[PDB]
Amino acid sequence: TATHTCDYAGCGKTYTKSSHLKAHLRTHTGEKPYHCDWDGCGWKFARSDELTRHYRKHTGHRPFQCQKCDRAFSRSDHLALHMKRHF
DNA sequence: GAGGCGC
DNA sequence: GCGCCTC
Ligand SMILES: [Zn+2]
Ligand SMILES: [Zn+2]
Ligand SMILES: [Zn+2]
Structure with missing residues (x-):
């Protein structure tokens, strides 16, 4: 479909319409070209990995x-801190 | 839990 | 993307 x-x-984000890809492409600008696209969030990141990591909070x-x-856990460091409970 | 960022 | 600081 997309x-x-x-x-x-x-990035790699795919769209069903040229319309949507066009307007998405406009977000890749400035100090932080990785804009979270979750409704009402508004977070922006300098690096793609930071957005990927962030976005797990929503899903x-x-x-x-x-x-x-x-x-x-969503992150390796969180799992590693958890593991201390098993000491 | 989550963001910044050096590596 | 991990691991460490930071908040
Ligand atoms: Zn994109
Ligand atoms: Zn978000
Ligand atoms: Zn456990």
């Missing part, structure tokens, strides 16, 4: 699974 891809560095994606319990 065939219109942003080719900006580290609840938690790929860092504790091997000693059923808890999971």
Whole structure:
């Protein structure tokens, strides 16, 4: 369905319309060209990795699974601090 | 938990 | 993207 891809560095966001890709491309500007697109958020980042990491707060994606319990985290550093509970 | 950023 | 500071 989505065939219109942003080719900006580290982005890859795809759109169903040329209309939408066009207006998205306008956001890649300034000191922080990685704008979170979550409704009402408004955060902006200098680096793509920072946006990717941030955006898990909105989706609840938690790929860092504790091997000693059923808890999971959005970030490696959070998992590493958690693991101290198993000492 | 989440943002900044050196690596 | 991890790991460390910082808030
Ligand atoms: Zn883009
Ligand atoms: Zn956001
Ligand atoms: Zn655990």
